[PDB]
């Protein structure tokens, strides 16, 4: 008549908060460029 029931599951460890890694889906590489342009001792810093 005795019976025993056991159960098991899992969760992220407490230290996970800083040891976690992430999977990323990337696409559509886009470029941003910073330029310095000088014309007739007229300097300009631009980014585009």
């Amino acid at each position: 008549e005795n019976t025993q029931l056991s159960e098991a599951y899992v969760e992220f460890a407490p230290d996970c908060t800083i040891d976690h890694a992430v999977a990323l889906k990337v696409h559509t590489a886009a470029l941003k460029v910073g330029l310095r342009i000088v014309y007739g001792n007229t300097t300009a810093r631009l980014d585009t």
Binding site: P14, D15, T17, I18
Partner: protein
Amino acid sequence: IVSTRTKMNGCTKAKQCIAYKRDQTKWVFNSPDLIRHTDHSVQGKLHIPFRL
């Protein structure tokens, strides 16, 4: 239920009989070595010291 009293029951064999020194006054951290009380209720929490 017997308080400060020795008591008897019909079935003379004292083996199958079961007794508790139960107090049900303190909360404890879940551990495999300890049977689960029928309440199986989450009553409180605690933090873990010395975080990262």
